[PDB]
Amino acid sequence: NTTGVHKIVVEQSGNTDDFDLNIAFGAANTGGVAKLYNENGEYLGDSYLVNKVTENKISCQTGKEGSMMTCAGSVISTSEQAGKKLKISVIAYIDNKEVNRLEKEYITKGSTLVENFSVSTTSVE
Numbered sequence: 001n002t003t004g005v006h007k008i009v010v011e012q013s014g015n016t017d018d019f020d021l022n023i024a025f026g027a028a029n030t031g032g033v034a035k036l037y038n039e040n041g042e043y044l045g046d047s048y049l050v051n052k053v054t055e056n057k058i059s060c061q062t063g064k065e066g067s068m069m070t071c072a073g074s075v076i077s078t079s080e081q082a083g084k085k086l087k088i089s090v091i092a093y094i095d096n097k098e099v100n101r102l103e104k105e106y107i108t109k110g111s112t113l114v115e116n117f118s119v120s121t122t123s124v125e
Contacts, residue, residue, distance in 0.1 A: 003030055004095035006066035010073065011089040012057045018079040018088045018108065021053040025060040027069040034044045034062040034069075066094075070120045075106050077113035084108040090119040 010023050023049040029033040036044040039059045048060045062069060071090055085107050092100035102119045 002094065002122060003027040003065060003067055005061055005064055005093075006034075006069035007061035007093040007096075008069050008119065008121065009075065009091045010053070010087075010103070011091075012034040012053065012056055014089045015079075015086060016056070018077060018081070018084040020051075020085075021040055021073065021088070022051050022076075022078040023053060023058060023071060023073040024049045025069065025071050027060075027062045028067045029065045030067050031065060034066055037061050037063075054080060056059060068120065068122045072118045072120065073116065075104075075115040075117075076114065077106070077108045079108055080110060082108050082110045088117070090117060092119055092121040092123075094121055095117065105106075 006027055012021055026085045033046050038044055050058055088104040090102040099121050100119055100123055106115055
């Protein structure tokens with residue numbers, strides 16, 4: 001069964017001040033639209049959108065009847081200096097069992113860097 005607590009953790013490290021990290025989370029339950037919760041179990045709404053993430057770790061999860069979760073993100077550089085690095089890890093879980101992972105490293109070239117990513121708990125290999 002694919003039904004359980006669907007969770008996606010986004011982590012950033014490096015020159016975090018020289019980038020803008022924008023992430024959006026969406027999920028589905030066996031009943032319909034899923035409620036979203038943070039690590040402390042606080043309700044976030046049915047869509048969780050964080051613009052210019054300042055935290056080094058962002059987490060989003062469903063209830064026990066979750067069927068899917070998607071995380072879409074964008075990385076935009078805010079520096080004219082080349083060689084600024086951002087490390088991103090996107091880890092997907094179903095009942096605290098890792099089901100998917102994306103590891104990315106972004107490096108500035110002097111021009112505006114516009115990068116995107118999309119990770120889901122139900123992505124087929």
